[PDB]
Amino acid sequence: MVEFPEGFVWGAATSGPQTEGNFHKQHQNVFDYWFATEPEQFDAGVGPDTASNFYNDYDHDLALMAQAGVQGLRTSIQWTRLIDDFETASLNADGVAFYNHVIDSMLAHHITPYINLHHFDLPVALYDKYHGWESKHVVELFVKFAEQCFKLFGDRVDHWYTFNEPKVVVDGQYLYGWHYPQVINGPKAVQVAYNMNLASAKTVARFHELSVRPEQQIGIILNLTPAYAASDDPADLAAAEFAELWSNNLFLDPAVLGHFPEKLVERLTMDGVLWDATPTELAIIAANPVDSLGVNYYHPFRVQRPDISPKSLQPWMPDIYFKEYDMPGRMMNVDRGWEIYPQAMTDIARNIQKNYGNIPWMISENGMGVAGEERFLDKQGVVQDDYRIDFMKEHLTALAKGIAAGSNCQGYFVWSGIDCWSWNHAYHNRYGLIRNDIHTQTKTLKKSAKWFAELGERNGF
Amino acid sequence: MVEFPEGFVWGAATSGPQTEGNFHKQHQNVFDYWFATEPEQFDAGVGPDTASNFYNDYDHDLALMAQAGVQGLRTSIQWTRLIDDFETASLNADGVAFYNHVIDSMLAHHITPYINLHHFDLPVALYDKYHGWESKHVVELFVKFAEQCFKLFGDRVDHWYTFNEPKVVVDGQYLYGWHYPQVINGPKAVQVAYNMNLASAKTVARFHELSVRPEQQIGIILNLTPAYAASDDPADLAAAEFAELWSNNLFLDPAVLGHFPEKLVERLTMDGVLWDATPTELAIIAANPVDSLGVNYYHPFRVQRPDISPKSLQPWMPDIYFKEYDMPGRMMNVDRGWEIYPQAMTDIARNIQKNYGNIPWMISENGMGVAGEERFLDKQGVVQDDYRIDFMKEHLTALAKGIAAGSNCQGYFVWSGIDCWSWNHAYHNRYGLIRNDIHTQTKTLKKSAKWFAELGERNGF
């Protein structure tokens, strides 16, 4: 009734920081330090020190994911676990040993590894010493960490990603207080977006200098969620224009086309907040676009005119040009606060096909987070998460229309395999096909896990 | 808006004698002896013995030059420091170690070495024993010295020069009294100019027999300022034609074309002052042209007829055919007594392009000297030397339009990187991107140093 291309990958996505726990980890990332000093900023004071116990229980957790139909698992390597000295990227022997264990264990459970290098987990010491992603020297230290990952694990990992959602690092660390250091500074944010695009292009370049087999490829993972104008009012259309350039093109265009979006550069310049770039850096970005795209999609983005004129006396923010809009009658993931709009999948697919060379891409994250899932347990402690199955069906239906129209989508990864630690929200909302009882770290397939395994067997539903 | 070829080298120029100091040097060059016996001939009694302390401070000095944007550094090895016995070019172990330290330090700071073999520093013992450059035996001893440099340092130096401006040695030692021994004798000057051309050619032959890598190449550094005639009257046109042949073709033609300028030798012959040359020597000159050209430009050269007839009874001098002329309305460096005329660089570029097979060449010196620069210190001890930036801006604009017309210019070297000892003028005028407080040997980047680094980054301005 709804079928998918031959070879389509059915996978799951997590990250190191949200699964491993902090057991024996050498360095604190910014979230580790945030929790150590202000535990009250986290749901129930549950931080990342244990998370979903993946450091200790990886082998059996991978077996459960394989049970759940996870043919590919995408997670991340922590800079703060792998590296001893950041300046030279010397190696923490115990951390290298741990990532070889989980990659080997993925293979033994017949899971294809997809390895992302960075997922919101900047080392706090590099923020204290250089201001983190503001520093083009920190950019270089990142590339040297990437180089080690490629040399250590490239022999049995084909599929890599530089970053998960750099835009969330920019927004979170420098615009809205979501991430420690909670800086609130538009111009810095512009430089950080620049610096992270540059780090990604420099990592792509080093990846291909070091690759040995043709099937090795490196990509990036972004939100491509479209900006719908609230109305056809010119002021709402103009707000949606800028929201689109700034939330999507800022990263999509340099990663895939090789250059920054022309209209955005012009607006940033006119406002006096343009990044500092050099011709040599821009040439690196132009010469090393990603091999593939990971699309994270959860909810649409709707936007109307700003309440006050953008020429008002205020600190510069991208938000001076647009304000978020609530559509009456929207479908809502309420205990979460997000709109549910599957059709955006189709728009994204068409946009990639028409405007971005129909580059090979995957849905790298799609999922629904729900609170208090103990209420939906049945007589055997199996969460009856039909809502999650229906949510997956609605978005997969939309995806398949994009594919039949000709968009080069090659896989679908659910967020997430096993309930994992959702930053300051901790375990308030669950996303997994597999429930984790975090008091005992005992995990059990949900109803959606068996549906997912069957979806992969029939390559459809 | 003014841009340069890809690969363009942004560099700085100095010399051994003007930077090192005489710390532990085995031999006196002619300037050393001259300061030791008549220190009253040097500005403020400041001599060569400490200079800018490069012998003791080279590593930090190079680090400072690297942050000033010095991509290649051109300096010189002293005959009087490297060599123990001149007759066999046996080695002084401490001198060898010193120059390996310097060269290694350059590569460690990512500065490409450009090594010149001679910069006005004839060993004084060789003047006393053979009358120096008048002696073809001394020519042979220079070649034995050069051979040693190539063998010692050829493994990690690609770019060489035989001489910095032999013309200044001819002029200074044998015409106008600028250099000890201060001989005033036209006929000897003519022989010394022949001998040094021969010494350069023999050194080029020795270089290529010893070369290991195709990248290795050796040139000569000349001043090629054109002789602008004061007017169109034939007496003025005649004066300028000879001034051109004498001050430029005398060295350019044998160095690049492999033969001497015929209308010049004809006049030296008719005046009975021609050098003594053998056919075998002339064969060496023709068989070993240079691989490249270093051009020194500072100010134009304007010329009018001589006040009396060249037939008058008087000692033969090149000047009997021309007199320098001062053009009304000239743009002046009124403190230093130099006219500013950046258009001459465009003329040089065109002459090399049209008449010397567009041989690869660089601006090996260009710069502006200013006295009493403490007048422009900020509150943090940084010279505000905007005049120097504008000087560079004007000459680089002229340089670029020569490159646009097709001239094969590949680099631009500032005189100088660090303030250095300008012979009898000592430290009266400062040329550097980097100030030296000569009493303490404490060096500080000037404003122009920051403006030189960014220029290298844009490869333009």
TrEMBL record, chains A, B:
GO MF, one example: beta-glucosidase activity
InterPro entries according to UniProt: GH, Glyco_hydro_1
EC identifiers of the protein: 3.2.1.21
GO CC aspect terms: cytosol
Keyword annotations: Glycosidase, Hydrolase
SUPFAM superfamilies attached to this UniProt entry: (Trans)glycosidases
Pfam families in alphabetical order: Glyco_hydro_1
Keyword field contains Flavoprotein: no
Top-level enzyme category: hydrolase
Keyword Hydrolase: yes
GO biological process: carbohydrate catabolic process
Protein family per UniProt: Belongs to the glycosyl hydrolase 1 family.
The protein, known as: Beta-galactosidase
Source species of the chain: Lactiplantibacillus plantarum (strain ATCC BAA-793 / NCIMB 8826 / WCFS1)
Organism ancestry: Bacteria, Bacillati, Bacillota, Bacilli, Lactobacillales
Name of the coding gene: bgl
